[PDB]
Amino acid sequence: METSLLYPVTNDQRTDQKLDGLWQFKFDEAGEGEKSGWETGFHDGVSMPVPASFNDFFTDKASREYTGDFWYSRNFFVPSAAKGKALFLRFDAVTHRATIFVNGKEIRTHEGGFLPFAADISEAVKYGAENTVVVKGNNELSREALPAGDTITLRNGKKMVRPFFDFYNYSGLNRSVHLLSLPQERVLDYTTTFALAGNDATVNYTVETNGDAPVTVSLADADGQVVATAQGKQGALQVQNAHLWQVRNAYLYTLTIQLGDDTQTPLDTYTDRIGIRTIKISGTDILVNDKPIYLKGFGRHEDSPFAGRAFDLNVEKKDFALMKWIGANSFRTSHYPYDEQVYKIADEEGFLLTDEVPAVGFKMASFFKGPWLKKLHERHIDQIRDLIKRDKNHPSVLAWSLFNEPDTIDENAVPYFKQIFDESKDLDPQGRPRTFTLSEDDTIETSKVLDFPDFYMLNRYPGWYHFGGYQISDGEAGLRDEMDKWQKAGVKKPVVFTEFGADTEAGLHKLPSVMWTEEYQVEVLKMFSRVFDDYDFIKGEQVWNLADFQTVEGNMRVNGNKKGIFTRDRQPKAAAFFYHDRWNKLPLDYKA
Amino acid sequence: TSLLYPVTNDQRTDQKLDGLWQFKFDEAGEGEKSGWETGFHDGVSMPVPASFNDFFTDKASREYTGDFWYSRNFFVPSAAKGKALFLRFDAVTHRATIFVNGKEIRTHEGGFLPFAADISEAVKYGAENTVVVKGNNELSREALPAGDTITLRNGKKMVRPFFDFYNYSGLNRSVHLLSLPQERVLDYTTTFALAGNDATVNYTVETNGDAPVTVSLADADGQVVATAQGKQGALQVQNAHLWQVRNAYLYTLTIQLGDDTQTPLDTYTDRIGIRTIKISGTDILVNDKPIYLKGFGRHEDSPFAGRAFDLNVEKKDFALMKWIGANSFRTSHYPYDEQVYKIADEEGFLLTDEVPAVGFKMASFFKGPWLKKLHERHIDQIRDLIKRDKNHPSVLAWSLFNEPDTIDENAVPYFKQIFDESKDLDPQGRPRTFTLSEDDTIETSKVLDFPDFYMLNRYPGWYHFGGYQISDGEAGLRDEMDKWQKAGVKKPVVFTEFGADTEAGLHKLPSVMWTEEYQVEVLKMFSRVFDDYDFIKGEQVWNLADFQTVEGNMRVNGNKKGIFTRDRQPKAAAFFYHDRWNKLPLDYKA
Ligand SMILES: [Cl-]
After folding, report:
1. Of all helices (H) and strands (E), which one includes residue A382?
2. Chain breaks in chain A (C to N over 2.5 A) after
3. Is A405 known to be catalytic?
4. What 8-state DSSP symbol labels residue B79?
5. Is A572 in the same domain as A498?
6. CB–CB of B430/B398 below 8 Å?
7. Do the chains contact at A507 and B506, CB–CB below 8 Å?
8. Distance, CA A11 to ligand 1 centroid (Å)?
9. In terms of CB atoms within 10 Å, which end of chain B has fewer, N or C?
10. Annotated catalytic residue within B497, B516, B521, B539
């Protein structure tokens, strides 16, 4: 029930100072952190950068694999000019679980390590003095929290995780920490939808505030020129001769919201950039601004060698440099909400994102049978609400993914899907498509939930998990056989392939190819391309993965996952040049 | 005296002595004073054929320089009493003395051409006998290939070559025990002419007696199509199947000694291809049509045998060269095992046969007292090479130096002499040439009148104008190509080295030197240049596969300029040539 997830801005009514830097850090295996006073703060631990996953900074494995309570400590200054304002610490992500103490006093908890949350500390600090913030984070996985997984205990006592997902359990203060001072009466939320008529457009907005003061809304273009204004919390901004936002061709207008009448100084100002564009599913078409498009891309994680799962602006800007070069125009934020700065860059660069909530693991290799479904569901729907509230105004969000590879064959999955889909059908004012990925075991013959998603996202791995090597010929025929069945039943919704590919160890070559070589990656991708091109209802290809990424140790995991088109260092495998050639030859309206 | 390859029939036997010999180093030079020439069994087992270097875990052995000893027992059949008995050594790198049953039979200089020892009177027919080989692998400016031997401050001897490849040494090729007739074929020659659909093989036969000679040619199905009598003669082949590039057809030649009445005294058989080679101004003509050369760039180098011939690697190297569209290669920088040419003959490849005249330059050379003995051994190894490989249809040209220092005006007497003393050795009179290094250019080279066609070694984008400078390196190469064109070049030009070290697995966007992408970028550049000039009639890239090399800070475990890895898998540049070369016809530029 987060009152507001607006991204921090700086103006005369709102301040935002980052608390990033080095913190004190201590493990707590015994769980006696609070018994012995760590919540008042400490400086007898190890320095830990923020934001950063804490796991890879340690040379010993038990610390890399640590599972339990852990503590971050820091001092921060509160200016005396802040007295009277609404004061918040905004945590952009604490994986997975956090209790926040300021000066020894408990402020709040939070569940879910991938969305932001703020702590009202207005009453917990001395103004004009140094205060202390302590974070008691937790790490464990259970089937009652997203991402789904288990926590086991080695015979020697140490806890460790057995995830139901691929990626590594990178943990800790994974994203920035802000100190905010906001007006007492302020903007909490706003919403935008768009309509196009001829060369003109209309933004339809609403604004939520914690009070009754008047609301002025003003829309300015790229050069600061005001082009529409309106009064009140509902309204319609008329933009004549609009500059539409276009795939791989962004145009962003600045939106400005202010509280007060013209006898006041503005009691609050908020500011955000939005793109004027519309998204419709029509038949099997995905329409952006009423012309069909064809998705090309990935397939991503937030993973980097030094930050773990933490947001790094350098790695993010290179991922976009690469993705623009290679011809992509879309990617899915698998398998969890990304740092907010990523959606701002997709807006700036004209990319189409599939925003995913962290519901991986709904799949035991009897899931929906059990009793952890009650608590799991609360957290799932709550994480879906907060995700849609945070990112709804980004032009680059195209669709919401509400599961990843859930067990759709279990008939008991249908009551759960009915509930999730019912409870979310109206969260997004733009009413974009809501979907999920179907795993390989989940086909037109075996899935029970094919009626729900607004378009289809298939995860197919012929040539890797099935029909590998010289059997690849049988795998293509068996995929063509499935795609034949969709066609017969007459798919009325678009189909998008969202995973496929091949683990590839850069530098491994063979002629002829063998699984794991660079040549085999290309043969596999060429094979998929031949299938995609032979069916009109296939409307996009998102390969797995963009880069190689870290993973839980295992005998099938050559240090992480290696399915990337690029290495973890962000350099290209042979498959990168394949797609660089294919994707820059496919137009935006491919198949139409 | 005879370098014919061994064959098996009723007059001639041939049995390999390959396998595990005994082996000992002789750093002191006491082996003969110690009685080792009588054979020994107190050393280490060593495969033959194979270089001995890579079988030792200590660097002192791997790098050993000096006298080393091989010893083996072998059985001489009773049935062989009365024939000419021979130990034939296919290659002993670089120097050998041969002992049988402790008796010194013969010595040999040069480590890449075969020699035979007559052991007819040194054996006990019907029992075991001993063969011991005393080898040496020192280098000096008086032997090919050229280099120096130094002593370290700790006494140990170490080689410092004037060439790139590693000093792989020992019994690098098979050892045969031969049984030959007392009167036998020693040599033969072939030359060809064409006329319509008919051809003429012009042969001669060298013998060590006066018995009559009888030559017959049969086609691939065994049908006889021409006979002749006499030590000189001409076989008339009606409606001949010509030997074509990447399209071989081989006739079987059979030489037989003795008149129509006696038991046959000797039989010798070989496989030849009917085809002609002419340099017509600026074209290379095979069967009177112009060709365009594409290929490598090779070494005899494999992980486990070293320099030694390994038939598995050779058939694999050939499988790859056909896959990639190539049709030629140069046996840099020394004659190869004789099997390489027979496969070349069966696969219709064109070979440039190179004598180990490498390292004739320092970092001058033709201004030293070593030339006199160097030249002795040089023109002798030229004679042995042409005598051995004459009759192969697949040998296109002879290469008499690799990267000699032709800038000094003193190279000119020596070239003059080498080129006069080889003038009339090859009966087919194929073109004689050599490679010009980066420093030897139209502006600076003093031996440009000698070669029959020009072989160019250029490394823009690697040893000069690397990295972002590559564009200035391309411009300089076209500069030099403009000056050749200005100088009115009348002989053909073939690029025979160019390329870039590449560590398989190193990727960068944009590229940096040593990555797979940069190599493709460099090879594309050279291609752009080659295609804008008509006198350029061939591209032989360096190198086919990563090969081993002396240790140095620029050698990342050997040379890495190879299109394929030392294990013979492709780098990205493999697929660039696979695309390009399989689209250039055999008559590109005509
Ligand atoms: Cl206070």
Report:
1. helix A373-391
2. 365
3. yes
4. G
5. yes
6. yes
7. yes
8. 24
9. N
10. B497
